[PDB]
Amino acid sequence: EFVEEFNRLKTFANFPSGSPVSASTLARAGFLYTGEGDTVRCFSCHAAVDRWQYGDSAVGRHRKVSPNCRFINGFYLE
């Protein structure tokens, strides 16, 4: 259901314009938008990450936060 990138990106409906990190970048990293702030949450491991900054890596932060997530370890790559 959220295994496809595009379905995740449809959660970024009201995502703060001018977030240092874009909704695409975050959708690619496996993240859904919570609808609050710039707070997102990974669809597989359910970890949330907010407070995005210039030069952040969506993938990097996601791994840092949850290094054993099924998605970022490629277990969803079709």
Segment interacting with Zn ion, rule: CB under 5 A, options 5-13, 21-29, 37-45, 48-56: 37-45
Segment interacting with Zn ion, rule: CB under 5 A, options 4-12, 17-25, 35-43, 53-61: 35-43
Distance CA 73, CA 62 (A): 11
Kindly state whether residue 49 participates in binding Zn ion, applying the rule CB under 5 A. Answer: no
Distance CA 62, CA 17 (A): 21
- Given a contact cutoff of 8 angstroms between Cβ atoms, the answer to whether 76 and 43 are in contact is no
Kindly state whether residue 45 participates in binding Zn ion, applying the rule CB under 5 A. Answer: yes
- CB 13 → Zn ion: shortest distance, Å? 21
Distance CA 36, CA 68 (A): 25
Kindly state whether residue 42 participates in binding Zn ion, applying the rule CB under 5 A. Answer: yes
- Given a contact cutoff of 8 angstroms between Cβ atoms, the answer to whether 30 and 62 are in contact is yes
User: Could you list the residues that contact Zn ion (CB under 5 A)?
Assistant: 42, 44-45, 66, 69
